[PDB]
Structures are given as C-alpha cells and as structure tokens.
C-alpha cells in the first residue's frame, strides 16, 4: 500500500508543470490516426501512456510497485522502439525516464 502511494506520487510529478516541456508526448495514448502513425500498431504490440497508468493505479490494478514500474518502462521502450534514435521525442523520453528512474530507485 505504501509502495503504491509512492508510485502515485511519482506519476504526479511526471505530470507536473516543471517537466511538461518534455513529458507532454507521454500524457495520452499515441494518436494512431495522426499523419505518419499508420504503422504504429504494427510495430508496437502493447501501447502504454501516463493517463492509462494513472487509470490503472486508480483502479488498483497494480498489486505492487514492480508492476507499475513495468508499465512505465513499457511506455518508454515503445518510444525507443518506434522512433529513430535521433528523434526529438526520444531525447524527451530519456529526460522523463531519468526523472522516473531516480525517484523509483529511492522510494
């Protein structure tokens, strides 16, 4: 229970104004109808995003912090898999993942 409270706090920080300039691509599910994304679901078998993670915390779907962390890392991994490594969204992902990993390590 205490683990999951910390997970909620980590996600709240990831949604916070101070990180918004690089966190915003991850707020909502990737829009697969947008121009250029017609192949997203062919490449990414398990989409994930911060609003879906929030809804799962609110439904108590995660039984512990490790399950929550797996979905956060899935979100970042999907970004690293789909996009070219030099893409601006990958640099944003690395920054937000640093925010996450330092908090998740220290809970």
């Amino acid at each position: 229970s205490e683990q999951l409270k910390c997970c909620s706090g980590i996600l709240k920080e990831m949604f916070a104004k101070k990180h918004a300039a690089y966190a915003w691509p991850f707020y909502k599910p990737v829009d697969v109808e947008a121009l250029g994304l017609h192949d997203y679901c062919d490449i990414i078998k398990h989409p994930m995003d911060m609003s879906t993670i929030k809804s799962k915390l609110e439904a108590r779907e995660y039984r512990d912090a490790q399950e929550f962390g797996a979905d956060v890392r899935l979100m970042f991994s999907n970004c690293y898999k789909y996009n070219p490594p030099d893409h601006e969204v990958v640099a944003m992902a690395r920054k937000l993942q640093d925010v996450f990993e330092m908090r998740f390590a220290k809970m």
Binding site: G36, L37, Y40, Y82, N83, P84, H87, E88, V89, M92
Partner: peptide
Amino acid sequence: GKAGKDS
C-alpha cells in the same frame, strides 16, 4: 512516423 513535435 512522428513529426517534429513542440506542442
């Protein structure tokens, strides 16, 4: 894939 983002 994804375009230049910035918003």
